[PDB]
Ligand binder design. Structure first.
Ligand SMILES: *CC(=O)NCCNC(=O)c1ccc(C2=N[C@H](*)CS2)cc1
Lengths: 10, 136
């Protein structure tokens, strides 16, 4: 789940 | 060595504030990604550090609470960089509040977390070399 902005690249 | 990646990251966050406390490409790429992350993802780091109220007696639980939240539904490289930067920021905050003895304690908690909860994911996802190719 995308919960942090740094998750978006992953 | 996970201890050495922790120690070099913390030593660097503290040297950037004026406080004194190839594998070289991994350390260098991690320093640059965390520096980048602290500017770009200010909002996510402010939410992580918002309910800290750092004291020697509450520090362990504050660190465990943030890191459990960060990794609860999975591991990716973004969360790994954010783990190093959140540990770094807790060390800087500890020194700033005259709780510099927390620095060694935080380093221990970070080394244990890496060894016990992040090592398997790192090894199964191309190791630190994949990190360097992707972020470096
Ligand atoms: C940036 C990164 O980690 N890139 C490597 C490829 N992505 C993954 O290995 C990866 C993607 C997504 C997830 C999760 N989704 C739900 C929360 S963690 C884990 C790993």
């Amino acid at each position: 789940p995308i919960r942090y902005e740094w998750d978006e690249f992953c | 060595d996970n201890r050495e990646i922790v120690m070099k990251y913390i030593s660097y966050k503290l040297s950037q504030r004026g406080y004194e406390w190839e594998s070289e490409v991994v350390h260098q790429t991690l320093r640059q990604a965390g520096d980048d992350f602290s500017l770009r993802y200010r909002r996510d780091f402010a939410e992580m550090s918002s309910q800290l109220h750092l004291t020697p007696g509450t520090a362990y639980a504050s660190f465990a609470t943030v890191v459990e939240e960060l990794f609860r539904d999975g591991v990716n490289w973004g969360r790994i960089v954010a783990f190093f930067e959140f540990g770094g920021v807790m060390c800087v905050e500890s020194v700033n509040r005259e709780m510099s003895v927390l620095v060694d304690n935080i380093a221990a908690w970070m080394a244990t977390y890496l060894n016990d909860h992040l090592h398997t994911w790192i090894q199964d996802n191309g190791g630190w070399d994949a990190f360097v190719e992707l972020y470096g």
